[PDB]
Design a protein around this ligand. Sequence first.
Ligand SMILES: [Ca+2]
Ligand SMILES: [Ca+2]
Ligand SMILES: [Fe+3]
Ligand SMILES: [Fe+3]
Lengths: 388, 388, 168, 510
Amino acid sequence: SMLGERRRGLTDPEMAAVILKALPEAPLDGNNKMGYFVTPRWKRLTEYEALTVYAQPNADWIAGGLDWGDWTQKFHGGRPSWGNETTELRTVDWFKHRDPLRRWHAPYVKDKAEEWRYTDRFLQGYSADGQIRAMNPTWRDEFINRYWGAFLFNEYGLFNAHSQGAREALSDVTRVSLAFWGFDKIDIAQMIQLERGFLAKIVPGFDESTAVPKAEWTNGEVYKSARLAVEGLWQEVFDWNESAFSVHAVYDALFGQFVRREFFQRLAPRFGDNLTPFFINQAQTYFQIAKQGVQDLYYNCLGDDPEFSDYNRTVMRNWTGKWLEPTIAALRDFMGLFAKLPAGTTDKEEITASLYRVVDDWIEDYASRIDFKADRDQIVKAVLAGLK
Amino acid sequence: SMLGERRRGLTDPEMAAVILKALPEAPLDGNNKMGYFVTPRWKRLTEYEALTVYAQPNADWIAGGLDWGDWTQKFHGGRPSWGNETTELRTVDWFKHRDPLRRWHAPYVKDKAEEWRYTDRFLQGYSADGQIRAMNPTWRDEFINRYWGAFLFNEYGLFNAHSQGAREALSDVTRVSLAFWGFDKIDIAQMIQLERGFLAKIVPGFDESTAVPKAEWTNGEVYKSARLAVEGLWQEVFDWNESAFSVHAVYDALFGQFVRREFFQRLAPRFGDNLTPFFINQAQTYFQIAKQGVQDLYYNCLGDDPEFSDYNRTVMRNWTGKWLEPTIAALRDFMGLFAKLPAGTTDKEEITASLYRVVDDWIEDYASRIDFKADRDQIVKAVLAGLK
Amino acid sequence: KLGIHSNDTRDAWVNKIAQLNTLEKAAEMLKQFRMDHTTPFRNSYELDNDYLWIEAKLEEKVAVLKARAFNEVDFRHKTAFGEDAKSVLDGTVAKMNAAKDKWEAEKIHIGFRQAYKPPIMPVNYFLDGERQLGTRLMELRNLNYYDTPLEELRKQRGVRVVHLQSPH
Amino acid sequence: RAPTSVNAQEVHRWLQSFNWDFKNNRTKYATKYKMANETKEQFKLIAKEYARMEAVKDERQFGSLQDALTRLNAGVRVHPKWNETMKVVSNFLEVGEYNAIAATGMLWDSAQAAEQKNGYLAQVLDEIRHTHQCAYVNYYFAKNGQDPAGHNDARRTRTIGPLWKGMKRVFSDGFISGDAVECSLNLQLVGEACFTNPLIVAVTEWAAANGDEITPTVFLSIETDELRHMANGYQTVVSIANDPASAKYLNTDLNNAFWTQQKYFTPVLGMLFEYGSKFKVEPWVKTWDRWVYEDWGGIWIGRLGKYGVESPRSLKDAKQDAYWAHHDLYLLAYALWPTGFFRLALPDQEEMEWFEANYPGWYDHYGKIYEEWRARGCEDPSSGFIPLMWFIENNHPIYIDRVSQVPFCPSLAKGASTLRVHEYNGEMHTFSDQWGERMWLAEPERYECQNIFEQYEGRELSEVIAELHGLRSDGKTLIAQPHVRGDKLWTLDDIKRLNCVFKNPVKAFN
Ligand SMILES: [Ca+2]
Ligand SMILES: [Ca+2]
Ligand SMILES: [Fe+3]
Ligand SMILES: [Fe+3]
């Protein structure tokens, strides 16, 4: 019926009157702030904190927890639902972390959703403006489809490296930031395939199939030492804090930043390709989004923990060193691609300047934070020793 | 107080009871489709058509109007609020036009807003990732600050060219598309300035002042004929369709597409400039969006009008020849910018080819639509003459 | 001074834990604490309300010391005792796949936790074990889970049945 | 040169080829089953499209909240009983959403087929949206409500009471501790399929019946995300149904899963619905029977039959123990009202007529007790009376199941009254049913959760509340109350003077 059948307490005369009659004449407490007891990272409490902090039911025996008692149900053997034992790192309070961007689900999907639709329009303009006409056939069929297409699995692998962390993180603020770091990675991977799928639609004869890129990844040479580092950070690491740290503050900051930015984002232009750099723009904005959180977690919080500063800083340097090597190995194996580029596309003087940029940045954004002594020269020379 | 003081009929038991009692058993008509009497362009009437079509109170003496009688108040002298006398074109119904993108206000600001936010994120990730390091100094300080910047006034002029149309357009659907074509142009002009203001922040010594690019615009040679054409389209055309048609189906289709895409989009990537191509992507997207509306109005509705097709085509051919000449002059002078580039940046063949692309795109997307007999060889040859 | 989060019995252990300044007894004391105060097989339940918190406050001190008194290679392959992480994991899994029943398997897993739980064993190997050890325990346990009547099951667990009330 | 683009499906076409083989490509969690890496997911989503479909729902929801609803003062014109009830429903469901995050992350790890992982991953995100959605409901009610206490700090104040322990079992620990597959049965196969999904809508029905338009606005959004999780749960069984181990463990983990969930919600939901409201929608008996018996245990379970899934054996039994369960529970809840973070109310004349009408014999037992309690002054803070006292005086011990954490009083209950007490290695254990007894007997080290009496034993009530900040702004008035009126609110002092001292009830057996 036009009026319907269900009567509603807010609008139904009889029911609403009963509700109104039962109402007090003033709120039974003037304190209307849902996260009032939470200690602000900034001047005022943000919606981000009120909605996130302490949603995890940890007891006090887990740094920061506010509940009490053992869990109600545990793993066969007795393993706690969550516990201190799942990470080498120790802290005064696991709830100290704060995403500099204050990203909860809402803002998070709002931004990626805008990007998705911005992306869709971009592709329709690009195709209608016929920009594909100025793109180098070789670069397209060989470097974007094969090598770039194969890097899809690199990002994809770094994504899955977040599965355990999504299950073991010791706090809500760390769990959300972490899940977003992983989601952004799968995003990029799917974006590399999106481009390949696009090209297929406007470039007859272009196969979107992963077949080619996959084989270059699984049984290739360019990304051999690379895949080994990924299969390691993902399946061989069991400490959630080691995966997040190692991946975002070691592997991906060196190998990843060099490949995405110092190779494609830098060479794609010279081949009349404004398409790929469009997606690499996203992956780089994302990288910088994550980095702020990854720094706030492992440095501001852990590395600078008022009681375990020394401890963590040591364990991290330990990881920094444990992975800096597999990283370096994955970078030199990448060099074998520079001899694939048409003769006269890039001299080593550049590679040295770009290879030094990935390292230098890494040093100012990570290594120097945990007081890890890194030698720019030895690093650069090491990966170079595999070049051409 | 907690409950408030104003009583609402939807919630106040007493008032609601009064409203509920005066209500009918069901709706007094089952046709709950606002705009139900509008001939849909597609399967079913769209929200875009319903919220727009017939909003303009035209009387039957202005093709397609549903009202009757003269206006209530006219200009001193007798000039009608709206009238046939403000355009040379004729049609059987001014309300035929449909924006292929069905953009009414909400969708429009939604997309531009996403673009604003996405742009904001881009710059932060671009700046934080330190990408200017790789941008060639000369290209940045001379070709972006001076020449790209100067192009800001070209787009600004084209924007202003839409002022009269906003007041004179004979229908709501046409007015709205016009307003959006114009508003998209002012935005581009502002993005070109957004880029300069940005470089001023991350590149020490870069002056964001518009003086330099403005002196280039108002006094230089490279843009001389372009400025002359723009000043004319803007202020010497008193016919709202000649203005919109000539701007989008002649001048911006040739000069604009050449400068944005065949010069800047094409050359910036060569000088390690991913910054400008970012904004050009928007302009090209906007250009492709407008083209659809422009083609629907001038080609599908007017140029193919069942009663005035041959007439409108004659007039648009007239307008095309009128503005093709000053547009060729605009391109001819632009050719001068090539001699300003670093030796070996591009050659006569690359320029001639890019020139032929633009003209061929123009010939099939516009000229051929009205049977304008355009000769590609002749146009390119006339422009090439400006190659200093 | 009674409390749930702050109480004498707790202030007592931090006072005690503080005296530690050698990874030696620290590591040893953690294992003891675990043997007496954790799991159904604990030696006592007198710290029931505070053991979880103290255990962690203990693990902390053991971590800081083990970090300062261990080289990088060992810190991730050698237990706080001196044992070789891997060798243990593989031994415990070797024995677990040997167990002739749930009852045996059960004792191998629980005992494993009490002994090598970090900061003793490196987390990587610990959870790696937790994967295999837990898989064995469950496989045996969940096999014909309901066939054994409660009466008989109760004798197997060996509980002191103190009271049974059932109108049905 | 036609305007072209690429969509979710188009990219998802090759998502399956994203995973590659290598020695260590295996789950990090202990399990008894093998999920086929050949499994597919129903919805072909990409991170980006997923973001878009959820941001659209957000815009509506938050638009209604911040605008139309705020203008209608929808945050205030809600019945006092329901404003309270939502402190529990929203925050308690919040933990379910939050642990479901970890749960699906664990399942995302278990999955081998790239599509199944993506399916679970999609949920990981939904649960995060739900965690924040439930958080927003309390947040909104705290800011625009008639009583912010409880809504504003349930996250910490919920730790004072016993109802919370049980919630954690089915919605926290149940979702993540154990064979990943068992955790999937708790969460998706039973949790969401049998309870969560339909209660979400049910909650909106009761909310609207009581003036709450805020909750319907948020829960209905959350609702829209549930068909993906159930599909994830369904695909879980499909991914193992082809494995021999499955036929050897699936039904046993599912039955434990069924009992685990029903054990808490059967009594708890009925109580929140029928006692935390003024206007009713439908007797819990009706609802329960329909949900669990005909829909879940009937239609839904019937679909997986072909996959080797049988109706839980403890099903008949669950029905037996159900009828008076929620009515039995509220007695304990109100009796221990000072341990909550919300305000409870005693049934009024209209309600008592409703209960008796729909639950023959309700008055002769619960009705009379409540009237007895009220006449004695349980609502007035100068009476010095707390119903917990009535339980002591009439020798009616209140125990806590060692497994489910659910409070039960066998000497008074009109529902089940079985009681099994054991002792093992110096500790006593109390069980309320044959199924939970078995789980402990078989897996004693999985359930070592200290009950409320164990922790509070010897402590004076007033100081337990004080230490856990069970007070309101003024630091004098309690958050919890034995009535929902504006005046005569009990203070910590009114409690201290009672001189109530917690005792471990199992100790009576010596
Ligand atoms: Ca000149
Ligand atoms: Ca040449
Ligand atoms: Fe959920
Ligand atoms: Fe769900």
